[PDB]
RNA sequence: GGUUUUGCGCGAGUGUUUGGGUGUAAAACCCGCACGCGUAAUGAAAGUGAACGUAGGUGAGAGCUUCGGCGCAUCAUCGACC
């Protein structure tokens, strides 16, 4: 039962790590002379 | 070879440019760039900012780093130094990080524009397989 | 895995835009029937059971009796104003109970009720 | 036109591509002062005379 | 974009092209000096171009196009 | 800030509209107080507008006339703003050098030659004002004959950002090819005038230092040829 | 070119001009246009069978 | 109204003058050298 | 359903088209949440978990060079760590 529990915990941890990676990617993507304004 | 395998008209324009440079100039830089342009994609592996910075660490700074490939941003590299990078294609993240660091993103046509003989240049390749 | 007669048991999807427009017409017909009312009933905020999806929340089946009583909406009158009621669910947590109470209060504050006949 | 601007900035996950060539004029690229200066002397002509 | 338009007009399609089995391709554009579709004379790929044409009135004119 | 609505009509596609916008800019440049208050950002917008106006100019003779007028505006601007005018011109040229196809490249090179000659013949009065000579030579030392690769525009503070502009080897080669012709046209190649001799000697030292310090073989060879031109006092 | 002129109902310029978007400076790739066009033309089809 | 010669054509003409001078010098040298070659053979 | 190669797009991320919005209506355009593969491995398992050295040196090595010297990819050896 501990074997099965650690398997389930590992799967959940992998999914959570993927979600955190997506959040980190979102954060990273968050981090007058131009023609469109001068000739507007 | 005889004809580029790529179907990109701009890649063929670059091929014409570097054929002319290789024929009318004794530059091994121009010759190797022409051969690498003739190369296929899997024979042109992408290079990373971590790789180019690790090659730039020594006194080779202020040399224009030249790679005929896609320059990809590497999340592992935390700080990007100032550098002038000229490559076939730049990913959006890589170009943005280079510009934020203060470097200069160049194309191969402007590379030939500035230094036709590849003076003060640092040639890099990607990892094979 | 083609041991059996997939020739006799292959079914295609050439009617995808037809089913899409049929579903749109069906929801439009429901809207025409319930012209001022919303097309779908209000549903509570519940949590995904399994450990892999604990931190995420979704929509439930219906609101709890305790949540309805706390929000001040009668059980027999909530379905008539468009609130799904689930007698099987239990709160088991003040956090979820308060979240659903806040949702029901927002529904009350955004709802306009007409006076019968 | 004013809405082409808005929609092409509004499309998520897509950016206006950066082209591999900056100066599209290959005639500019070849017949330029820097290139013509850096080139070496020609080894012949377009049409070569027959020797023997 | 003269090289790009030349590539598009020579490698893909040309509404003024009449390719023959006799080894020469003809250009139907009324402002082409030569009757052959080639890089030197293409009115579309050569932004700066010149042509000579005759009016119905017997008068001859020269035409200039610039980028 | 400054209200300058004529740049749009300068970039417009009608020759009459562009001429009217150029005359409006003539009146603007004549207006001394605004000319005294011209900043670097302002001169950058004006020279961008004139760059696109020349870009839109079609025929050879109109192009020559427009280039002459663009060169002649310098005597119209005041003393305290001539330096800003030339610096903004050369910043615009360095920013837009590579984007020009050959057909408009000839006329832009003619404009560069004309403006360089205009600066040299505005250097005039010692029969040559040393302040003007110093300004022009400082300009030539910074943009044309640079010991570095980039030019720093604006200053760094809480009220301003950054302009780093690289100097094109093409503009370097052109100035190395036309400075001898322009000094001959303006009259610094007279051996009697000691002031002229000192000025041309300073220019020769500038291009020579460029010859030893540069890292572009094209720049090296073309500077050597420019120094080897037989019309210079040294090689004669 | 920075701007383009606007023409009135009579075919003569109104006098107003508008800035061209960057989609008109975007690169031209006939090969990709070809591939997407064949994909779309096949995407419009309806099936047939005996 | 004389239509000045383009700057690129000026550069071409200077380069062509240099090329003609080089060609003339080389041709004269080859003439002389061929003379001594004929004598020695 | 697998696999090799060419081209193309993006790129440590990528795939709109289950579906929803939209429409000049089986077209075209749009995307909110998931999901598929990949971006760290090993051990039968408990589980543990990738820097001592410019992520190491030495020698080649394309290429650049102020001719003093710098050295891509990769290989062989001696290393370091999990
Ligand atoms: Zn044709």
Automatic annotation (TrEMBL), chain C:
Keyword presence, Ribosomal protein: yes
Q: What is the lineage of its organism?
A: Eukaryota, Fungi, Dikarya, Ascomycota, Pezizomycotina
Entry protein name: 60S ribosomal protein L13
The answer to whether keyword Ribonucleoprotein applies is yes
Q: Give the record's family classification.
A: Belongs to the eukaryotic ribosomal protein eL13 family.
Q: Name one GO molecular function term.
A: structural constituent of ribosome
Record keywords: Ribonucleoprotein, Ribosomal protein
Q: Which GO terms describe its cellular component?
A: cytosolic large ribosomal subunit
Quote the range of the complete protein represented: 13 to 129 of 213
> Mind listing the GO biological process terms from this record?
translation
Give the top-rank taxon of the lineage listed in the UniProt record for this protein: Eukaryota
Query: Any transmembrane segments, and where?
Result: none
UniProtKB/TrEMBL annotation, chain D:
Highest taxon in the source lineage: Eukaryota
**Family affiliation:** Belongs to the universal ribosomal protein uL4 family.
Query: By what name is this protein known?
Result: 60S ribosomal protein L4-like protein
UniProtKB/TrEMBL annotation, chain E:
Protein name from the UniProt record: Protein MAK16
Shown residues in whole-protein numbering: 2 to 68 of 336
Please tell me where Zn(2+) 1 binds in this chain.
Answer: 37
Q: Where in the cell is it found?
A: Nucleus
Q: What organism is recorded for this protein?
A: Chaetomium thermophilum (strain DSM 1495 / CBS 144.50 / IMI 039719) (Thermochaetoides thermophila)
Transmembrane regions: none
Q: Which family, according to UniProt?
A: Belongs to the MAK16 family.
Which residues are noted in the entry as Zn(2+) 2-binding? 37, 42
From TrEMBL, chain F:
Compartment(s) of residence = Nucleus
For this protein, the parts annotated as crossing the membrane are none
The record, for InterPro entries, names: RRP1
Instruction: Kindly give the Pfam families that the UniProt entry links to this protein.
Output: Nop52
Any single GO BP term: rRNA processing
Q: Gene Ontology cellular component?
A: nucleus; preribosome, small subunit precursor
Its main localization is nucleus
Please state what the protein is called.
Answer: Ribosomal RNA-processing protein 1
What are the top taxonomic ranks of the organism?
Eukaryota, Fungi, Dikarya, Ascomycota, Pezizomycotina
């Amino acid at each position: 039962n501990k074997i099965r529990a650690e398997l389930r915990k590992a799967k959940a941890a992998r999914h959570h790590a993927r979600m955190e990676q997506q959040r980190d990617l979102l954060a990273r993507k968050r981090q007058d002379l131009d023609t469109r304004e001068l000739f507007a | 070879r005889k004809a580029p395998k790529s179907d990109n008209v701009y890649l063929k324009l670059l091929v014409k440019l570097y054929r002319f440079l290789a024929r009318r100039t004794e530059a091994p830089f121009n010759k190797v760039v022409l051969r690498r342009l003739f190369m296929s994609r899997i024979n042109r592996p992408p290079v990373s900012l971590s790789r180019i910075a690790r090659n730039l660490k020594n006194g080779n700074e202020k040399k224009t780093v030249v790679v005929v490939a896609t320059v990809t941003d590497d999340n592992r590299l935390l700080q990007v130094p100032k550098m002038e990078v000229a490559a076939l294609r730049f990913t959006a993240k890589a170009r943005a990080r280079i510009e934020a660091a203060g470097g200069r993103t160049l194309t191969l046509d402007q590379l030939a524009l500035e230094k036709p003989t590849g003076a003060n240049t640092l040639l890099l390749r990607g990892p094979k397989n | 895995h083609f041991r059996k007669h997939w020739q006799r048991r292959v079914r295609c999807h050439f009617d995808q835009p037809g089913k899409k427009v049929t579903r749109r017409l069906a929801r439009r017909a429901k809207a025409a029937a319930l012209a001022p009312r919303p097309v779908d009933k209000l549903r509570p905020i519940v949590r995904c059971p399994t450990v892999k999806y604990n931190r995420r929340t979704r929509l439930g089946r219906g609101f709890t009796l305790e949540e309805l009583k706390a929000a001040g909406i009668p059980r027999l009158l909530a379905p008539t104003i468009g609130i799904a009621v689930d007698h099987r669910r239990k709160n088991l947590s003040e956090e979820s109970l308060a979240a659903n109470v806040q949702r029901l209060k927002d529904y009350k504050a955004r709802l306009i009720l007409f006076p019968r006949k | 036109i004013k809405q082409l601007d808005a929609v092409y900035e509004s499309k998520k996950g897509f950016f206006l591509p950066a082209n591999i060539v900056s100066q599209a004029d290959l005639s500019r690229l070849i017949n330029s002062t820097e290139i013509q200066s850096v080139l070496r002397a020609p080894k012949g002509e377009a049409r070569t005379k027959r020797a023997c | 974009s003269d090289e790009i338009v030349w590539q598009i007009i020579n490698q893909q399609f040309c509404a003024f092209k009449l390719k023959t089995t006799k080894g020469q391709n003809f250009c139907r554009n009324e402002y082409s000096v030569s009757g052959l579709c080639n890089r030197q004379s293409c009115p579309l790929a050569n932004s700066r171009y010149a042509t000579v044409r005759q009016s119905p009135k017997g008068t001859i004119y020269l035409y200039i196009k610039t980028i | 800030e400054k209200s300058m609505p004529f740049i749009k009509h300068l970039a417009s596609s009608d020759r009459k509209v562009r001429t009217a916008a150029l005359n409006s800019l003539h009146a603007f440049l004549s207006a001394r107080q605004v000319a005294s208050a011209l900043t670097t950002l302002d001169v950058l917008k004006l020279w961008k507008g004139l760059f696109y106006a020349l870009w839109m100019c079609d025929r050879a003779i109109p192009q020559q006339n427009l280039c002459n007028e663009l060169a002649d505006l310098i005597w119209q601007l005041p003393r305290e703003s001539v330096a800003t005018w030339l610096r903004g011109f050369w910043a615009t040229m360095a920013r837009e050098w590579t984007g020009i196809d050959v057909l408009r490249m000839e006329k832009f090179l003619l404009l560069v030659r004309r403006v360089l000659g205009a600066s040299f013949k505005w250097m005039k009065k010692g029969a040559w004002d040393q302040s003007k000579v110093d300004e022009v030579l400082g300009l030539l030392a910074e943009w044309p004959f640079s010991l570095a690769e980039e030019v720093r525009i604006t200053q760094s503070s809480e009220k301003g950002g950054e302009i780093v502009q690289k100097i094109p080897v093409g503009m370097r080669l052109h100035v190395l090819d036309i400075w001898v012709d322009e000094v001959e046209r303006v009259g610094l190649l007279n051996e009697d005038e000691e002031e002229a001799r000192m000025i041309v000697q300073r220019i020769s030292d500038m291009v020579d230092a460029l010859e030893q310090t540069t890292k572009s073989p094209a720049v090296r060879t073309r500077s050597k040829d420019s120094l080897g031109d037989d019309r210079l006092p040294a090689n004669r | 070119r920075p701007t383009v002129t606007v023409f009135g109902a009579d075919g003569k310029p109104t006098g107003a001009t508008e800035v061209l978007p960057k989609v008109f400076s975007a690169p031209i790739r006939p090969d990709i246009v070809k591939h997407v066009h064949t994909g779309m033309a096949k995407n419009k089809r309806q099936p047939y069978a005996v | 109204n004389d239509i000045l010669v383009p700057e690129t054509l000026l550069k071409k003409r200077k380069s062509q003058e240099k090329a003609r001078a080089e060609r003339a010098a080389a041709l004269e040298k080859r003439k002389q050298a061929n003379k001594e070659k004929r004598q020695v053979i």
